[PDB]
């Protein structure tokens, strides 16, 4: 990403910062827990109450 | 078929008087997802704690 640069030629490079992007620990945030707008509904059939 | 929650008192530490009485929220069983069989079990132990308080 051009650590230095003077106008065309006498520039010095440096490698970019290491950036690891993966999933979270234990897949935190994959699943809506404690989000009252949109929850889960394990129940029997005839879903009168979860 | 539901008993009432008992009114708990408020003690004021200065002057020693009683500062009113609110009902006992914070000790309420959330029965709002119980069928007709668990609702009778929950409202039995609510009728048990009122029977202790009436004594």
From TrEMBL, chain A:
Transmembrane segments: none
Location in or out of the cell: Virion; Host nucleus
Induction notes from the record: Expressed in the late phase of the viral replicative cycle.
Family: Belongs to the adenoviridae hexon protein family.
Function: Major capsid protein that self-associates to form 240 hexon trimers, each in the shape of a hexagon, building most of the pseudo T=25 capsid. Assembled into trimeric units with the help of the chaperone shutoff protein. Transported by pre-protein VI to the nucleus where it associates with other structural proteins to form an empty capsid. Might be involved, through its interaction with host dyneins, in the intracellular microtubule-dependent transport of incoming viral capsid to the nucleus.
Quaternary assembly: Homotrimer.
Protein's UniProt name: Hexon protein
Automatic annotation (TrEMBL), chain B:
Top-level taxonomic group: Viruses
Localisation: Virion
Protein's name in the database: Hexon-linking protein-N
Biological classification of the source: Viruses, Varidnaviria, Bamfordvirae, Preplasmiviricota, Polisuviricotina
Gene: L4
Covered residues, full protein: 2 to 56 of 278
């Amino acid at each position: 990403h051009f650590a230095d640069f003077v106008d065309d030629r006498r520039a010095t490079a440096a490698g970019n910062r290491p950036n690891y992007i993966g999933f979270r620990d234990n897949f935190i945030g994959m699943m809506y827990y404690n989000s009252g707008s949109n929850t889960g509904s394990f129940s029997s059939q005839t879903q009168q109450l979860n | 078929d539901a008993p009432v929650t008992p009114y708990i008192w408020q003690y004021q530490p200065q002057t020693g008087k009683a500062a009113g009485a609110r009902q006992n929220y914070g000790a309420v069983i959330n029965w709002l997802s119980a069928d007709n069989n668990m609702f009778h079990r929950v409202q039995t132990v609510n009728r048990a704690r009122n029977l202790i308080d009436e004594i």
